[PDB]
Structure formats: C-alpha cells, structure tokens
Design a protein around this ligand. Sequence first.
Ligand code: S5L
Ligand code: S5L
Ligand code: CL
Ligand code: CL
Ligand code: CL
Lengths: 305, 306
Amino acid sequence: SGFRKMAFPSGKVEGCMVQVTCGTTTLNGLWLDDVVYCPRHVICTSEDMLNPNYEDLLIRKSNHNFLVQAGNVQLRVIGHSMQNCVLKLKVDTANPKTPKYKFVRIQPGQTFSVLACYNGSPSGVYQCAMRPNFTIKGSFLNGSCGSVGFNIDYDCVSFCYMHHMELPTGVHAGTDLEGNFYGPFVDRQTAQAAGTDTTITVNVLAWLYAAVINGDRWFLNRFTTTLNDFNLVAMKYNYEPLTQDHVDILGPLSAQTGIAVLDMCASLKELLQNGMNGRTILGSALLEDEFTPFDVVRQCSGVTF
Amino acid sequence: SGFRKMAFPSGKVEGCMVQVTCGTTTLNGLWLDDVVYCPRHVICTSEDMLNPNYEDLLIRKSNHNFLVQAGNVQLRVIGHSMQNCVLKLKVDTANPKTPKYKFVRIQPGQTFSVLACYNGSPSGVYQCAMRPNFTIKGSFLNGSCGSVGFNIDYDCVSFCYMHHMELPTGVHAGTDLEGNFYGPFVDRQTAQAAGTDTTITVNVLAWLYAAVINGDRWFLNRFTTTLNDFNLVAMKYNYEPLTQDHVDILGPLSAQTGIAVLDMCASLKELLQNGMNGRTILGSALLEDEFTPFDVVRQCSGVTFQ
Ligand SMILES: CC(=O)Nc1ccc(NC(=O)CN2Cc3ccc(Cl)cc3[C@H](C(=O)Nc3cncc4ccccc34)C2)cc1
Ligand SMILES: CC(=O)Nc1ccc(NC(=O)CN2Cc3ccc(Cl)cc3[C@H](C(=O)Nc3cncc4ccccc34)C2)cc1
Ligand SMILES: [Cl-]
Ligand SMILES: [Cl-]
Ligand SMILES: [Cl-]
C-alpha cells in the first residue's frame, strides 16, 4: 500500500553527468559514448545573451576553450558542433558507464524524472510532468542548466529533457536532447513568459484510480456521463479535453476497479463542481495531475529496472 | 525557484541491492563490503510469524541454505549471524561498488530517501519522513522487504532504515541497519497498532520559511506568540510540541528571511485557525510536514526573493 511521487532510480544517469566550462560559465553536460551534450548558451557572456549569433560565437572557440570535468578527471575535447540549441563536444574518451539509451521527445501530460545537477555533481532526483503550456514546474537554481529529464523503459534510459532556463513565474523551460525547445521559447535574454496552463485530465483520472486501489473511495458515486457532457465540464474548469484515446488508455484501471472511465468522469465532475468538503484523496486537498495511467499501473505493480 | 519533494540520487544504493532467498521466500538485501544485511524474517514461513522463535529457526540453517543473487551472479554465503531483527550474511566477495557509508539511527521528523526494490532490483525512489508515531508513509508492495532508506549529505551514504512490514492501516515499519525497530513494533504477526499520528511542527515551520524564500508572504501576520501559548494551541490541532531545540534549529532560516521563529509560529497558529481560504503555499493546499529545516536549506536559494 501507499502512493508516492516516485522517480526512476537515477544511477544510470548519474554516471553520465559532467561539468562543462566555457570562460566564466560553468554548467552540466551529459556524457554518452564520446560526446558531451550541453546547452549551447554555455558559450555566451550575459551581453551575448541579449542577441546571440551562436555560429559567430562558436567559430571563435577552439576545442581547448571547453573544459570538461568527469569526477576528478579532465576530458579532452577533440571536436565541437551545434544541433539546434544543444552543443555536442566530441571527447577523446568514450564514457565507460554509458547506459543503453535513446533520445525521445515527449508530449505534454507525460511525466519524467529529473536529476538536478550542479558543477557536474548530481544533487537530487524528483518527478515532474511536461505541462500543457510546455513548461515544467521544476526545482532549479543558477548552475542547474544541462540537468536532464528521463524515463527508463525496460533497461533503456529514454532521455527526454535538458534544462535551459527559468521563466519569470519560477517555472522552467528546456529542450529535448536534439536541442528542440518544448514550447515557444528561445535561448536568449528577452521577454518570455509561461502561457496560461490547464490541468491534465487523463492524469487526474489515473490518480483517482490510484486512490481507489489504495482504499480511498468516498468520491465514488452511482452516476455516469457521456464523453461530450464531461468535456463541456472540463473546459469550464480549465481541464484539458478528454479523448477516446485517453478513455482507451484507462481501460485496465476501469476493469480492475469495476469503475468505468465515464463513471470516474462523473466522480471528477462532482469534485470540480463541489470541492472535497474537507476531505483529502491520497493525502492531497487538490486534484493531482502529475501521475500518468502508466505511472499508476507501474507503482501499483512493482516494475523494476 | 520551485520546491519539490526531492530524493538523493540513488545510484550509490542501487549498486548495493541484492536478492536473498531462503526456501520459498525471496526479499531484498543490502551488500556492503563482504556482508549482506536483510530482515531476519526471511527464514520464516507465514505460520511461523505468530510467535516465531528466530534463534530456533536459525540454528537449523546452514550457510548454503541462503541464496544471494547480485545481478546475474550467485554470491557464496560463508557465515551468518543475527543482530537484533537483521540477519548478516557474510559472503565470499566484497561489493566492488560499496560506497563510503555509515549506519545512522534517526529521530521522528527526520526525512530520508527510499529506494523501493523487488527481487533485488530497484523500482523507484521517493522521499519520506519518520513519523512522530515511528511509522513511515511509504509505497511498498509484497516483496519490498529489505528495501532501505538513506541520506547522502556530502558523498557518504547514511543508511537509516530497512523495510520490514506493512501495518493494517497501510503505513510501514522497519529497523535501523543494526536491526532495532523504530517504534514499539515487532517482527511478529500480532496486534501492534501505531499510536495516533501527529504533524511535525518544526518541519511545517521550515516549509513556511521555504515559501517566504521563494517569494510568498501572504500567510504572515502582525502578531507574535510565546512558545508555551503556541504549544497549547498547536496541541489542539494534533501538532507535535515545538521545543527550544526546534527554535534553535530554525535560527538560520529566520536570519535569511528576517522573520523571528515565534513570529512564524504566530503565522502557523493563524493558518490552523483560518485555513488557506482558496490559496496554496508552494503548490499545496495542506500544510506540508515532510521537509526538515536542513532539507529547506539544501534545496532553497540562499537569497530570499524579497
Ligand atoms: C522573478 C524573476 O525575474 N526571476 C528570474 C530572474 C532572472 C533569471 N535568470 C538570470 O538571472 C540569468 N539567466 C538568463 C537566461 C536566459 C536564457 C536562457 Cl536559455 C538561460 C538563462 C539562464 C537561466 O535561466 N538559468 C537558470 C536556470 N534554472 C534556474 C535558474 C534560477 C535562477 C537564475 C537562473 C536560472 C541565466 C531567472 C529568473
Ligand atoms: C491495508 C492492509 O491490510 N495492508 C497489509 C496487507 C498485507 C500485509 N501482509 C501480508 O499479506 C504478509 N506479510 C506478513 C508479515 C508479517 C510480519 C512481518 Cl515482520 C512481515 C510480513 C510481510 C510484510 O508485511 N510484507 C510487506 C511489506 N511492505 C508492504 C506490503 C504490502 C502488502 C503485503 C505485504 C507487504 C508479509 C500487511 C499489510
Ligand atoms: Cl535524526
Ligand atoms: Cl496491528
Ligand atoms: Cl532579509
């Protein structure tokens, strides 16, 4: 029993974290085989950030201007190139701890684990979700750029996020490992903001199934709804629309608990319209939306890596 | 910015997890140097659990009745002994991935990371706190026994908890790494309900200081309180008493934000009376008590967003 915000074990990623320094800037890099990936903004002074020409900034650098430190060992940079907003530093040593991995781009609503890092040294691990507005509600201080987000599928690390910046509301923005930003953000010092966010409906339903599995049933009711009537209510409360794909994905939880997806949607509708009336669900007074249907099934089944 | 329930990176502990089997029972063990530590109940059947005589069960076992698997490698058991509620299996191979470590027994209110494991393989990592009633609100299924709790302040792993059992209320009980239970629990199937739990007051105050550091002051008020009047109120809401030690420990967070400890106690008193009136603090609609003063200092910026 119990239900916690659980991250994947981080060991396979810890063995890839290095420190990258260019001039006065130090941030983190990810060392996989003979390449170190890091945010391309490592080559900018604060004035360059106002309007950077990364190709022009980069041509002025030699391989030796990039100092890469893996633990207490200095790695030798033997090549450099840019792919979108990521810099790829070819090194003369393949990482002996390179795990089996893939670079995957995730969709809003998907969750992942973040290994927060400073000076190439992992400091913490936590779970978060890619918001519908493409930001993440992370916990990051200056020096955390280059920290990565990942999932583990079987024995393979799927890297999905590299940290680049903090927005004025204290939320975070970054790229996939191919350097494509999530959201309409750019890697420069200019006016940027998180857009209005919404709640991830399919995840709230998954967490209500987790609560039923753990014995929290007070919110269940005799009613059902249609998908169209439920979506009219979701829009009213700034919840994402629920699709037939979301319904299909929640099928197993509907079968295990005897609570059809549209029957749980009727419970969610009543929770939105009336509140919790002093009660909590899995120790929360808010409806939690950072657990996917897969996260619920995994935590309630004990899948290992 | 931001404030998350953050665990320590689990890599150093993942390299120590093994599977221990005795007859039909398999659970997890922790392999450090040439010893594997695991719950002594690995030698029991379910029927043995009403009144097990561990000394009598153990004397009937040889070294070769214990099977230990580290990855895809079978380790050889060359000695065994029981220390309190833990079994220590001496093996013929020192763990090459043994980190720098210590065994530490923690007090209620302290937090630690749990690496949940099944069949010697890690499944996930999360943060939790030793409750005032000596239980932990973990997430554990059958087969998770032997999973450990730890902190890693400054590269040394401090192991503080080994998982033994789930109580009827769905909360968890276990031991330190010397096999001494936290709380009045025994590794026996018997009536042993946890005491009524309370809220860890010093941690709620630390988390209110985290909120101020991160830029939020809505919950503050113009008042102060004495320590005794605060305790009289707080005990009415099932909050733990705040001691002078707790006040001393909050000194650094008080200096960073400019809010006296007893002035923050007055804010907590008011929140307990009023609720949040539709507002949240660090993304929560409840008062959070599983972040210690040390955790807040570790995670938060040293510069308050004024
Ligand atoms: C309320 C408010 O105004 N807050 C605030 C004010 C200023 C900043 N940023 C800076 O001072 C300089 N940064 C500019 C910048 C531009 C573009 C790109 Cl791609 C990266 C970066 C860097 C950056 O954002 N790094 C960071 C990343 N994560 C967490 C941080 C936490 C604090 C400071 C930096 C962090 C550097 C952030 C937040
Ligand atoms: C809500 C509710 O009723 N929960 C619940 C449901 C079942 C049980 N226990 C058992 O079925 C068999 N266990 C008996 C037992 C006796 C004494 C000692 Cl020292 C250990 C053990 C084992 C044990 O507690 N292992 C476990 C550990 N952690 C998490 C578990 C989660 C489910 C099942 C086992 C777990 C084995 C306990 C609690
Ligand atoms: Cl302690
Ligand atoms: Cl009991
Ligand atoms: Cl101040």
